[PDB]
Design a protein around this ligand. Structure first.
Ligand SMILES: CCCCCCCCOCCOCCOCCOCCO
Ligand SMILES: CCCCCCCCOCCOCCOCCOCCO
Ligand SMILES: CCCCCCCCOCCOCCOCCOCCO
Ligand SMILES: CCCCCCCCOCCOCCOCCOCCO
Ligand SMILES: [Ca+2]
Ligand SMILES: [Ca+2]
Length: 354
């Protein structure tokens, strides 16, 4: 790029019913310099965050030549093996190195090694509901990825890596949109293959994760149907501070328990068409079963989400975002412990500093 600077103010109220509620104000500072002039360019990236008391700050250096770029330092990774999580006050912060290269157009290559992270400690296996032991650590996290954009309508994805001494994971993706005929048809195919690696600090891990999402969008209306399936002894592993990149990753639950199968229905409505621009509505529903409980029994769970988003169109407060997120989640196993109603209210404003 030729830079960007982005001061973000984030107001979030969060209510959970099992009761427990929280309110929070956050500030995210994101500065990406341009590159110095000359064949090999240099620049700097800086993250600063402030919450309520959380205070955190990052720097990364970057170089660039041709269509290739390297970065070292503080980082928000966004990729199939690690989707950084956007669902608390201040994002997670990883530390390490990233090389990307796209010298042949439509063919992108990426490599990434992560030493540390800040929710400033060592990288962790996500564990937040049991199975995988908590505080399972890896020395580093590596990923390598190849993106082939076959056409305007189709993108192929391979990726590979893992948390050293916990797990290795492979990934295939295929995304694409197609006009047909007044609206636009979309398919999103994701596959993950994971197993324990090295010392197996978590220890035995065995999982294949498949998800498929299909959408049809015409006017401001969008109907989406998803299908997700887990195979093997294990749940799908991923990093603490990330979300698993699956079709049925919802507000509260990931549907990625062992041997779990689930389906989703979702509807998105943009009311720019009814003449209330900046007003968007969403509702989705996932049903899951076939969970192999440590019990020996089968588990069933479902979740329904409702969302409202409003972007003010004009005024001093123009482009401020109001977002309402509601989750209802129920199981037939460990009901007290994991049933929830959740309400997230989010007010967010991005000031461009340039
Ligand atoms: C594991 C990620 C780091 C891989 C090391 C590669 C270091 C390459 O040097 C950066 C080159 O900068 C652009 C030149 O092309
Ligand atoms: C049609 O949309 C084109 C994009 O497709 C990407 C891969 O599609 C997933 C495979 O299943 C497609 C069935 O419609
Ligand atoms: C028109 C076919 C729609 C049926 C849903 C497909 C998902 C099948 O697996 C779902 C497993 O959940 C069982 C309930
Ligand atoms: C208990 C009803 C809560 C909200 C009612 C809204 C009904 C129309 O909106 C559709 C999405 O809401 C689904 C309701 O969630 C809990 C009941 O589950 C129904 C599954 O469709
Ligand atoms: Ca600059
Ligand atoms: Ca899980």
């Amino acid at each position: 790029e030729d830079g960007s600077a982005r001061l973000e103010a984030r107001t979030v109220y969060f209510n959970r019913d099992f009761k427990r509620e929280e309110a929070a104000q956050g500030f995210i500072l994101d500065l990406r310099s341009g590159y110095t002039e000359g064949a090999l360019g240099f620049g700097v990236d800086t993250l600063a965050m402030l919450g309520i008391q959380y205070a955190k700050a990052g720097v990364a250096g970057k170089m660039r030549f041709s269509q290739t770029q390297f970065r070292y330092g503080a980082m928000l990774p966004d990729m199939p093996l690690l989707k950084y999580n956007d669902g608390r006050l201040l994002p997670t912060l990883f530390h390490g190195a990233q090389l990307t290269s796209e010298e042949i157009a439509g063919l992108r290559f990426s490599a990434t090694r992560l030493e540390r992270y800040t929710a400033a400690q060592d990288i962790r296996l996500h564990c937040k509901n049991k199975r995988y032991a908590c505080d399972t650590t890896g020395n580093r996290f590596d990923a390598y990825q190849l993106d082939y954009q076959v056409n305007d309508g189709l993108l192929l994805q391979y990726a590979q890596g893992g948390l050293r001494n916990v797990y290795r994971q492979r990934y295939l993706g295929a995304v694409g949109k197609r006009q047909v005929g007044a609206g636009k048809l979309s398919a999103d195919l994701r596959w993950f293959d994971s197993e324990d690696a090295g010392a197996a600090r978590a220890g035995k891990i065995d999982n294949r994760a498949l998800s498929l999402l299909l959408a049809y969008a015409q006017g401001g209306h969008t109907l989406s149907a998803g299908w997700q399936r887990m195979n093997g002894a294990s749940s799908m592993p991923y990093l603490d501070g990330s979300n698993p990149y699956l079709a049925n990753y919802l507000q509260v639950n990931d549907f990625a328990n062992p041997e779990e199968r689930s389906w989703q229905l979702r509807y998105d409505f943009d009311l720019r068409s009814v003449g209330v621009p900046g007003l968007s509505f969403m509702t989705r529903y996932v049903n899951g079963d076939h969970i192999r409980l440590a019990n020996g029994d089968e588990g069933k769970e479902w979740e329904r989400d409702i969302e409202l988003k409003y972007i003010v169109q004009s005024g001093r407060f123009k482009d401020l975002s109001l977002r309402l997120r509601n989750a209802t989640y129920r199981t037939d196993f460990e009901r007290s412990a994991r049933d929830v109603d959740e309400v997230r209210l989010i007010a967010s404003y991005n000031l461009s500093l340039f």
